Amino acid sequence: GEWEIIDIGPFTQNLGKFAVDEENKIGQYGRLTFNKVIRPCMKKTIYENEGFREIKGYEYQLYVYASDKLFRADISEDYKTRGRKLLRFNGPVPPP
């Protein structure tokens, strides 16, 4: 797929909240509090294995502050189902 840098407006902040809420169901870090998503935010547009530029879905790479610690979260979104999944959540990591 292609990658681009995207804004950290409300839509991006809500991806961060999604990531923290999903990580809180897992419980690996205990109960995290969402603060904010920071730059840079990277979005991948994913195409079907067949055709040219048939959009399957999206992936996001976020830097998210939760409980005052910086994490990396990877999120997938399927175009047809509108379903979001937390793929990975790791850290704490140093600031970019």
- Using an 8 Å Cβ cutoff, are 63 and 70 in contact? yes
**Residue 12 interacts with, from Na ion, its own copies, none (CB under 5-8 Å by kind):** Na ion
DSSP readout, the chain? -EEEEE--SHHHHHHHHHHHHHHHHH-BTBS--EEEEEEEEEEEEEE-SSSSS-EEEEEEEEEEEETTEEEEEEEEEETTT--EEEEEEE------
Residue with smaller CB distance to its own copies, 31 or 39: 39
String marking each residue 14-53 x if it binds its own copies according to CB under 8 A: -------------------------xx-x-x---------
**Residue 11 interacts with, from its own copies, Na ion, none (CB under 5-8 Å by kind):** Na ion
Given the rule CB under 5 A, which residues bind Na ion? 7, 9, 11-12
Given the rule CB under 8 A, which residues bind its own copies? 3-5, 39-40, 42, 44, 59, 61, 74, 87-88, 93-94, 96
